[PDB]
A = this chain, B = another copy of it.
Amino acid sequence: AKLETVTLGNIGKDGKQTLVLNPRGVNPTNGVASLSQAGAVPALEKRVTVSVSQPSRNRKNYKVQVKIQNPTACTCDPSVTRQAYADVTFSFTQYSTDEERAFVRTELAALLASPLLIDAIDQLNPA
């Protein structure tokens, strides 16, 4: 699928903040896609990257990586203060069907909204 300009709505604690992402090409050096939000300087831009690896004989397994890394700035000119690294990595097999991948992805997506994870991410209280 073409890396279209995705946008996010009703995102946040109260579901109010919205963001817009524009594509920034794909680099052949490692075969990873990229997405970014338009901003004054590249340093303060929220970045989203996705990729899939060819299962070469060194690994004989599929990999899918999603890396979300957005910084924040505080005030001559703003500078980056702290990072918010958040990556997601998958793994499959050659004979794995579509059902398993769909089940894994959907259960992960729905569990990210489960109250247990809601509490775990917010206040960092161990289960």
A residues neighboring B (CB under 8 Å)? 1-4, 6, 8-13, 15, 17, 19, 26, 31, 33, 46, 48, 50-52, 62, 64, 66, 68, 70, 72, 81-93, 95-96, 98-127
Contacts and interface: CB of A to CB of B under 8 A. Distances in A.
Nearest to A125: B1
Contacts of A96: 82, 84
Given A33-B127, A117-B50, A117-B66, A92 B84 contact: yes
A13 B116 contact: no
A112 B122 contact: no
B50 A116 contact: yes
Give how many copies assemble into the complex.
2
User: Nearest 9 A-B pairs (CB), nearest first?
Assistant: A33-B127, A85-B91, A109-B112, A52-B126, A1-B119, A82-B93, A13-B102, A11-B106, A105-B121
7 contacts: A1-B127, A50-B116, A66-B117, A87-B89, A88-B89, A105-B122, A112-B112
